[PDB]
Structures are given as structure tokens and as C-alpha cells.
Amino acid sequence: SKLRAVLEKLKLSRDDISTAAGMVKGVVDHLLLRLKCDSAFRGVGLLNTGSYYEHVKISAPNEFDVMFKLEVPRIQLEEYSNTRAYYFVKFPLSQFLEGEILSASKMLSKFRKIIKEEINDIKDTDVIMKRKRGGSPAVTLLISEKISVDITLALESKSSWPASTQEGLRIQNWLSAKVRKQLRLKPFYLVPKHAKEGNGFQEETWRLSFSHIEKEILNNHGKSKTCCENKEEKCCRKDCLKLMKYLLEQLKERFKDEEHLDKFSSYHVKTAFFHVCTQNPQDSQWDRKDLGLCFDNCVTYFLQCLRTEKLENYFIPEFNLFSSNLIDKRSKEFLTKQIEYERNNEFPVFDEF
Numbered sequence: 001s002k003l004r005a006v007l008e009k010l011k012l013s014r015d016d017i018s019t020a021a022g023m024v025k026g027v028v029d030h031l032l033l034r035l036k037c038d039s040a041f042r043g044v045g046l047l048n049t050g051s052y053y054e055h056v057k058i059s060a061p062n063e064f065d066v067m068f069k070l071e072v073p074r075i076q077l078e079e080y081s082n083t084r085a086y087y088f089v090k091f092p093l094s095q096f097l098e099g100e101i102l103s104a105s106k107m108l109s110k111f112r113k114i115i116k117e118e119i120n121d122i123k124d125t126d127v128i129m130k131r132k133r134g135g136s137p138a139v140t141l142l143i144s145e146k147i148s149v150d151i152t153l154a155l156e157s158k159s160s161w162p163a164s165t166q167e168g169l170r171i172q173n174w175l176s177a178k179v180r181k182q183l184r185l186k187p188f189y190l191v192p193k194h195a196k197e198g199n200g201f202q203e204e205t206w207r208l209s210f211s212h213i214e215k216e217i218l219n220n221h222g223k224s225k226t227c228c229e230n231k232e233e234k235c236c237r238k239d240c241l242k243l244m245k246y247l248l249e250q251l252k253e254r255f256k257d258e259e260h261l262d263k264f265s266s267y268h269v270k271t272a273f274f275h276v277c278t279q280n281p282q283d284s285q286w287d288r289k290d291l292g293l294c295f296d297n298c299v300t301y302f303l304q305c306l307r308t309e310k311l312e313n314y315f316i317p318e319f320n321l322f323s324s325n326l327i328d329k330r331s332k333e334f335l336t337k338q339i340e341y342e343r344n345n346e347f348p349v350f351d352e353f
């Protein structure tokens with residue numbers, strides 16, 4: 001009942017949703033219209049993604065994610081240095097070429113410059129652009145000093161997914177082989193997040209994103225097509241993800257003056273959650289009346305990922321989110337220590353008083 005009380009606190013206010021939805025749509029639709037007036041971005045379209053649109057945003061509707069997608073015909077990908085997730089793109093767009101290479105940094109720079117200029121002309125609403133966030137492919141706005149919106153430029157390809165995904169998306173026993181085939185016929189996206197190059201970055205490179213598929217999975221998440229559509233099939237999958245997100249969010253807030261938790265994000269618990277869904281494919285393994293055990297399942301799986309330093313990207317199995325190339329052993333051991341403490345003491349970080 002403690003966890004149910006936490007979930008109640010984490011629910012979004014209907015009034016907050018109403019106000020935030022109206023503000024975000026108005027700003028983003030406006031910016032989409034304006035971007036379409038530039039010769040480079042004339043074909044851009046909108047794709048809403050991330051936790052708000054997955055219905056697993058917690059506490060307040062104060063952070064939205066949207067892709068501004070662009071279909072570039074005759075796209076040719078080249079994997080960057082066996083990184084599995086990062087690619088060169090080979091091809092109004094000549095302004096972004098460096099050779100035959102379509103430079104991710106050049107496109108993102110112009111994207112940001114246009115948005116910056118357009119929000120300066122917005123006089124009816126309080127809209128500012130936040131300082132660049134290291135390693136982010138997004139341009140981030142703050143509306144009314146309270147609502148953050150991450151706008152990510154994304155190249156769209158309707159080609160077959162890259163070979164690094166061949167063994168990913170292992171949903172056959174959970175969501176079915178038919179659905180896996182259907183999802184892999186959808187487009188994929190490249191976002192301007194650059195591969196590491198020594199102490200710097202390979203500024204021409206793009207990164208694969210399957211944020212849209214993650215949304216498809218979370219909003220059609222049951223083995224039963226009617227999971228969570230009736231009183232007899234309410235599962236606790238989304239509640240477990242919300243609780244894992246809150247656990248990480250609260251620990252990051254508490255330990256914010258440490259650096260050890262700075263490299264963890266909600267995508268780590270999202271990825272681990274998808275793996276637990278693969279391991280537990282039946283809706284009967286996610287019964288509402290088993291919330292406590294299901295959440296403990298999720299926590300101990302995440303702990304094992306930290307201990308083994310293994311957290312495969314759900315779509316790209318050879319991309320290890322917990323590689324020591326990305327996160328120090330010391331940082332993973334530190335997070336392990338804090339989560340173990342929370343588990344062993346019935347999650348005091350969840351308590352308001």
C-alpha cells in the first residue's frame with residue numbers, strides 16, 4: 001500500500017495537463033510552421049515522443065519531447081568505427097555537406113539558430129532557449145519558466161533498419177513475432193548526437209533513435225490486446241516503470257552534489273524495464289495485486305545490470321549502456337550502494353516525511 005500511495009502522489013493533475021498541453025502545442029506548432037519557411041527544413045514534420053506521450057510522465061507535466069523529422073531521399077548510411085549506434089549520412093541541403101558527408105553538427109547548428117531567432121519574435125508567451133546541454137541532440141525551450149520542451153531534429157529513413165539492430169527488439173515471446181515484423185517495417189531515425197572521438201567528438205556523425213518504437217511498445221504493452229482496457233486486465237507494467245523512474249529521479253536529486261550519479265538517466269531504467277518485460281512476457285506476471293513483487297523484480301534486475309556492468313540497448317544489443325567506456329565502475333558501484341540501501345529499508349526515499 002506504500003507503493004500505491006507513492007503512485008497516487010505521482011499522478012499528473014488534470015488541470016496541469018490541460019494548461020501545459022495548450023501551451024506546448026501552441027509554441028511547437030508555431031515553430032514548426034516557421035521552420036517550414038526555411039529552404040533547408042521545408043519538409044519537416046512533427047512526432048511526439050517520450051514519457052508524456054507514453055503516459056509515464058510523473059509528478060508534473062513539465063517536460064515534453066518532440067521530434068522534428070525530415071525525410072532525406074536516397075540516404076546512404078555508413079557505420080562509424082564499429083560503434084553500432086553512430087553513423088555517417090551520405091547523400092537546399094548542400095549547405096550541410098562536408099564532402100559527400102551530411103554533417104550532423106552543421107544541420108543542428110542551423111536548426112538551433114532558426115529556433116533561437118523565432119522564439120525571440122514570440123511576444124505573446126514567455127519562451128526562452130536553455131543553454132546547450134552536453135551530448136544532447138535536442139534544442140531545449142523553457143515556457144513560462146516552468147515547462148521544458150526538447151525539440152530534436154531527426155532524419156527519417158524508410159529503409160530497412162541497420163544491421164546492428166538484427167538481433168535487437170526481442171519481443172517475440174511477449175508482443176509476438178508478427179508485431180516485431182510490423183515494427184521493423186516502420187521508419188527509423190537519426191538524431192544529431194555525435195560519437196566520441198578521443199577526448200572530443202566526431203561532429204559529422206548521427207545516432208540511431210527508436211524513441212517512436214518505444215512509444216508504440218509502451219502504449220500497446222500487453223500480450224493481450226485488451227491489456228489495461230478493462231477491470232480484469234489492469235496490469236502494473238507502467239506503474240513499475242513510473243516507480244523505477246521516481247527512484248532514480250529522487251536519488252539523483254539527493255546526491256546531486258556528488259558527480260557519481262550525473263551520467264544516469266531515465267533511459268537506463270526504461271531500457272532495463274523493457275528487458276524485464278522480455279523476461280516476463282505474460283500479463284499474468286504483471287498482475288496489479290502483485291505490484292510489490294513486480295517492482296522488486298524490476299529493482300533487482302536493475303541492480304544486477306549495475307553489478308555486471310551490462311545493460312544492452314534494447315534495439316542495438318552490442319551497444320552496452322553500462323560499458324565502462326560510458327560510465328565509470330565507481331559510479332555504477334555508488335548507484336548500486338544507494339539502491340541496495342533503498343531496497344533493504346523499504347524505499348525511504350519515497351517518503352514525503
Ligand SMILES: Nc1ncnc2c1ncn2[C@@H]1O[C@H](COP(=O)(O)OP(=O)(O)NP(=O)(O)O)[C@@H](O)[C@H]1O
Nearest residue numbers: 049050051052056057058063065210211214266267
Ligand atoms: N541514452 C539514450 N539513448 C537512446 N535514446 C535515448 C537516450 N536518452 C533519451 N533517449 C530518447 O529520448 C527520449 C526523451 O528523453 P527523456 O526526456 O530524457 O526521457 P523520457 O523517456 O521522456 N523520461 P522523462 O522525461 O524523465 O519522464 C526517450 O524517451 C528516449 O526515446
Ligand SMILES: C[C@@H](C(=O)Nc1cc(Cl)cc(-c2ncc[nH]2)c1)N(C)C(=O)c1cccnc1C(=O)O
Nearest residue numbers: 065067133135136150152191193207208209211265
Ligand atoms: C543523454 C541525453 C541524450 O543522449 N538524449 C537522447 C539520445 C538519443 Cl540517441 C536520442 C534522443 C531522442 N530521440 C528522440 C528524441 N530524443 C535523445 N539526454 C538524456 C538528454 O539530453 C536529456 C536530459 C534530460 C531530459 N531530456 C533529455 C532528452 O534527451 O530528451
Ligand SMILES: [Mn+2]
Nearest residue numbers: 050051063065
Ligand atoms: Mn521526457
Ligand SMILES: [Mn+2]
Nearest residue numbers: 063064065150
Ligand atoms: Mn527530454
Ligand SMILES: [Zn+2]
Nearest residue numbers: 222227228235
Ligand atoms: Zn496492461
